[PDB]
Design an enzyme around this catalytic site. Structure first.
Site, PDB file in Angstrom:
ATOM      1  N   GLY A 168      32.495 -55.980  -8.059  1.00  0.00           N
ATOM      2  CA  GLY A 168      33.639 -56.256  -9.114  1.00  0.00           C
ATOM      3  C   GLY A 168      33.331 -56.964 -10.458  1.00  0.00           C
ATOM      4  N   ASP A 198      45.387 -64.081  -6.075  1.00  0.00           N
ATOM      5  CA  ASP A 198      45.059 -62.886  -6.199  1.00  0.00           C
ATOM      6  C   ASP A 198      45.198 -62.042  -4.765  1.00  0.00           C
ATOM      7  OD1 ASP A 198      44.012 -60.549  -7.186  1.00  0.00           O
ATOM      8  OD2 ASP A 198      42.061 -61.025  -6.939  1.00  0.00           O
ATOM      9  N   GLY A 242      30.405 -53.897  -2.391  1.00  0.00           N
ATOM     10  CA  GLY A 242      31.050 -53.576  -3.542  1.00  0.00           C
ATOM     11  C   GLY A 242      30.500 -54.390  -4.774  1.00  0.00           C
ATOM     12  N   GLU A 253      28.910 -59.048  -6.775  1.00  0.00           N
ATOM     13  CA  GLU A 253      28.442 -58.022  -6.220  1.00  0.00           C
ATOM     14  C   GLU A 253      28.378 -58.751  -4.573  1.00  0.00           C
ATOM     15  OE1 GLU A 253      24.940 -56.008  -7.470  1.00  0.00           O
ATOM     16  OE2 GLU A 253      26.414 -54.564  -8.044  1.00  0.00           O
ATOM     17  N   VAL A 254      28.877 -57.877  -3.631  1.00  0.00           N
ATOM     18  CA  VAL A 254      29.078 -58.398  -2.198  1.00  0.00           C
ATOM     19  C   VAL A 254      28.232 -57.521  -1.534  1.00  0.00           C
ATOM     20  CG1 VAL A 254      30.871 -58.508  -0.395  1.00  0.00           C
ATOM     21  CG2 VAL A 254      31.493 -58.949  -2.684  1.00  0.00           C
TER      22      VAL A 254
HETATM   23  O1  ON6 Z   1      34.989 -63.806  -1.496  1.00  0.00           O
HETATM   24  C1  ON6 Z   1      34.794 -62.788  -0.244  1.00  0.00           C
HETATM   25  C2  ON6 Z   1      34.561 -61.759  -0.644  1.00  0.00           C
HETATM   26  N1  ON6 Z   1      34.764 -60.954  -1.790  1.00  0.00           N
HETATM   27  O2  ON6 Z   1      34.717 -61.498  -2.857  1.00  0.00           O
HETATM   28  O3  ON6 Z   1      35.037 -59.673  -1.648  1.00  0.00           O
HETATM   29  C3  ON6 Z   1      34.252 -60.804   0.549  1.00  0.00           C
HETATM   30  C4  ON6 Z   1      34.036 -61.385   1.961  1.00  0.00           C
HETATM   31  C5  ON6 Z   1      34.093 -60.613   3.223  1.00  0.00           C
HETATM   32  C6  ON6 Z   1      34.004 -59.223   3.398  1.00  0.00           C
HETATM   33  S1  ON6 Z   1      33.958 -57.826   2.375  1.00  0.00           S
HETATM   34  C7  ON6 Z   1      33.905 -56.559   3.208  1.00  0.00           C
HETATM   35  C8  ON6 Z   1      33.680 -56.255   4.637  1.00  0.00           C
HETATM   36  C9  ON6 Z   1      33.719 -55.202   5.158  1.00  0.00           C
HETATM   37  C10 ON6 Z   1      33.751 -54.015   4.447  1.00  0.00           C
HETATM   38  S2  ON6 Z   1      33.845 -52.624   5.406  1.00  0.00           S
HETATM   39  O4  ON6 Z   1      33.676 -52.870   6.794  1.00  0.00           O
HETATM   40  O5  ON6 Z   1      32.764 -51.840   5.025  1.00  0.00           O
HETATM   41  C11 ON6 Z   1      35.217 -51.885   4.923  1.00  0.00           C
HETATM   42  C12 ON6 Z   1      34.879 -50.734   4.018  1.00  0.00           C
HETATM   43  C13 ON6 Z   1      34.044 -49.557   4.233  1.00  0.00           C
HETATM   44 CL1  ON6 Z   1      33.018 -49.361   5.363  1.00  0.00          CL
HETATM   45  C14 ON6 Z   1      33.921 -48.698   3.113  1.00  0.00           C
HETATM   46  C15 ON6 Z   1      34.727 -48.845   2.003  1.00  0.00           C
HETATM   47  C16 ON6 Z   1      35.660 -49.815   1.921  1.00  0.00           C
HETATM   48  C17 ON6 Z   1      35.774 -50.868   2.950  1.00  0.00           C
HETATM   49 CL2  ON6 Z   1      37.005 -52.302   2.759  1.00  0.00          CL
HETATM   50  C18 ON6 Z   1      33.868 -54.148   3.183  1.00  0.00           C
HETATM   51  C19 ON6 Z   1      33.945 -55.522   2.552  1.00  0.00           C
HETATM   52  N2  ON6 Z   1      33.814 -57.401   5.489  1.00  0.00           N
HETATM   53  C20 ON6 Z   1      33.826 -58.862   4.738  1.00  0.00           C
HETATM   54  O6  ON6 Z   1      33.905 -59.667   5.792  1.00  0.00           O
HETATM   55  C21 ON6 Z   1      34.226 -62.757   2.037  1.00  0.00           C
HETATM   56  C22 ON6 Z   1      34.655 -63.558   0.804  1.00  0.00           C
END
Ligand code: ON6
Length: 328
Positions: free
Chosen positions: A46, A154, A44, A50-51
């Site tokens: 924002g 948030d 993603g 970028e993550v």
């Molecule tokens: O500050 C942060 C942030 N951040 O800023 O977004 C993310 C994170 C960790 C994440 S983001 C993150 C994932 C897993 C996914 S996911 O499993 O790919 C879920 C999906 C998918 Cl496949 C497609 C579309 C949406 C989502 Cl939510 C998305 C985003 N898991 C993580 O542990 C830690 C700290």
């Protein structure tokens, strides 16, 4: 001018910590090895980062890499210091490392990876029991960060990672989080529209941890009523009108009058006069299995205009709604 406000709990946590705990501007980042992490795919983007999913090649384990954009510079050290302060707390995402990205030339934060289901998918699946279970898990995170003198600011479904298979929850994206200092005036341009507390919408700056409890209440309402989002404003003005259509205008006026706040004159034409509605109005055959007297009482005690009258995280955890949840 406006009457001042203070948190009813953890008011003086930061004043009794050493200066380095909260004085994030002076924090010195210790860097790890950027070559430990190989980016695999973008998850993603924002406003502020970028993550990516990545692999840590020192253990071949999945991690998450958040590459910070050079937006507000102060946010960088603020987020880092907050993550280090909270590390190890219940259901707080674990910052595993900080590296310098060679392309962006900015910090990349390395986190533990959580397997998540898109909240749009997952919330349609949650049982009554699941809702209570995960709400309790979020409350653990919020009581922890509040006890450590931090407000998240948030809270929203996108910032709650849930691995439903392993019944594991993490509160993420601490990029808007801030240290609470009694009497301090804060930016009201925080939180996402549908989760903004009344304090933000009426431009009251001396807010506190109780902002996160409004946001949580908005989440609860969307889950138990199956209405996503619950307060569906087309802008920040209409957001307050939508809230006043449920909580009523008389209690809104009582709120702003208590703090000697003046509504934006913009509301004169659009606010109208609304009675407080009973929560039973939003119950129907498709959500009634998620609703109980306990759920409604709990929701009622979160969604209060007066930030001072809302349940604290700890008080929320004491509520009858959670009596059925098996304690770990
Ligand atoms: O500050 C942060 C942030 N951040 O800023 O977004 C993310 C994170 C960790 C994440 S983001 C993150 C994932 C897993 C996914 S996911 O499993 O790919 C879920 C999906 C998918 Cl496949 C497609 C579309 C949406 C989502 Cl939510 C998305 C985003 N898991 C993580 O542990 C830690 C700290």
């Amino acid at each position: 001018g406006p009457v001042p406000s203070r948190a009813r709990v953890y008011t003086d946590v930061n004043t009794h910590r050493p200066r380095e705990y909260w004085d994030y501007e002076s924090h010195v980042v210790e860097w790890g090895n950027q070559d430990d992490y190989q980016l695999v795919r973008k998850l993603g983007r924002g406003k502020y980062s970028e993550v990516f999913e990545a692999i840590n090649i020192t253990n071949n384990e999945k991690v998450v890499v958040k590459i910070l954009k050079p937006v507000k510079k102060k946010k960088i050290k603020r987020e880092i210091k907050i993550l280090e302060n909270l590390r190890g707390g219940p259901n707080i995402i674990t910052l595993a490392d900080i590296v310098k990205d060679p392309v962006s030339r900015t910090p990349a934060l390395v986190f533990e990876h959580v397997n998540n289901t898109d909240f749009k998918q997952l919330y349609q699946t949650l049982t009554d029991y699941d809702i209570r279970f995960y709400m309790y898990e979020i409350l653990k995170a919020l009581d922890y960060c509040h006890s450590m003198g931090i407000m998240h600011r948030d809270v929203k479904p996108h910032n709650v990672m849930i691995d439903h298979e392993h019944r594991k929850l993490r509160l993420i994206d601490w990029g808007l989080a801030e240290f609470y200092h009694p009497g301090q005036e804060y930016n009201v341009r925080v939180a996402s529209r549908y989760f903004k507390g009344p304090e933000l919408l009426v431009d009251y700056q001396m807010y506190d941890y109780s902002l996160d409890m409004w946001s949580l209440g908005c989440m609860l309402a969307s889950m138990i009523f199956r209405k996503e989002p619950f307060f569906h404003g087309h802008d920040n003005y209409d957001q307050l009108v939508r809230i006043a259509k449920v909580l009523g205008t008389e209690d809104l006026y009582d709120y702003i009058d208590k703090y000697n706040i003046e509504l934006d004159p913009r509301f004169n034409d659009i606010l109208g006069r609304h009675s407080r509605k009973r929560w039973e109005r939003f119950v129907h055959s498709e959500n009634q299995h998620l609703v109980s007297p306990e759920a409604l009482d709990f929701l009622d005690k979160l969604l209060r205009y007066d930030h001072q009258s809302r349940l604290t995280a700890r008080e929320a955890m004491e509520h009858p709604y959670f009596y059925t949840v098996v304690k770990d």
